[PDB]
């Protein structure tokens, strides 16, 4: 990790803390227990939902596209149509994969 905390000087997670992402474990003469920090979890949830919504919004375009037909003396136009389709498909596949890979980090 870039900051050295998770899998760092804090070695593992808690399966007994279920109501949040980060929190405390306390122990005193009256007993022990787990609790979660609501403000930190709320800020993280705000950020993550904003990120996912932005990703969804940026990838909306037009649709309803169907193919064409050509006769035997129109092979150059057919090849140009095929080239355009393939190029656009390649570019969008690259964009989606790169975006997901980079945001996961």
């Amino acid at each position, epitope marked *: 990790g870039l900051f050295g905390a998770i899998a760092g000087f804090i070695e593992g997670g808690w399966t007994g803390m279920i*109501d949040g992402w980060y929190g405390y474990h306390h122990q005193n003469e009256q007993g022990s227990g787990y609790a979660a920090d*609501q403000k930190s*979890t*709320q800020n993280a*949830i*705000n950020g*993550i*939902t*904003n990120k*996912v*919504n932005s990703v*969804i*919004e940026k990838m909306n375009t037009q649709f309803t596209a169907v193919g064409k037909e050509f006769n035997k003396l129109e092979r150059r136009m057919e090849n140009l149509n095929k080239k355009v389709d393939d190029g656009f498909l390649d570019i969008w596949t690259y964009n989606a994969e790169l975006l997901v890979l980079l945001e996961n980090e």
Partner: nanobody, 119 residues
Framework: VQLVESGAEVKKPGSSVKVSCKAS????????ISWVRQAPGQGPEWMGG????????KYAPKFQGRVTITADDFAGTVYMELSSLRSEDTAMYYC??????????????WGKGTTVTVS
């Protein structure tokens, strides 16, 4: 934020009814959502709630066992399904939103409510 519910229902006893709530804004929410009902001549009554991301659901002890709350997040919709419809289940139903991601006693935005009749 505005909450809109599905149309009113008239159903026979013993059947099951499913209603939906739709919220404006981005499909993914950062607040919990609860379902409330009110019978004529009575106060409001909490049924259950659902929490974002974690996906955990809470139910009232009386409605436990016959109420199911689900969420579809890429369309922004929340569904509530009620089964074994008795005659007393006719009432107005609201979907309400909470201030944060946890189900608590403070609901700041309410819907318009829709009627379910069991005759």
């Amino acid at each position: 934020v505005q909450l809109v519910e599905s149309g009113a229902e008239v159903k026979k006893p013993g059947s099951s009814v499913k209603v939906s709530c739709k919220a404006s804004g981005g499909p993914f929410r950062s607040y919990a959502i609860s379902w409330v009902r009110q019978a004529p001549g009575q106060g409001p009554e909490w049924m259950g709630g659902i929490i974002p991301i974690f996906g955990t659901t809470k139910y009232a002890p009386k409605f436990q066992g016959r109420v199911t709350i689900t969420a579809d997040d890429f369309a922004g919709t929340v569904y509530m399904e009620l089964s074994s419809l008795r005659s007393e289940d006719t009432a107005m139903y609201y979907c309400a939103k909470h201030m944060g991601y946890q189900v608590r006693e403070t609901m700041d935005v309410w819907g318009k409510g829709t009627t379910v009749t069991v005759s």
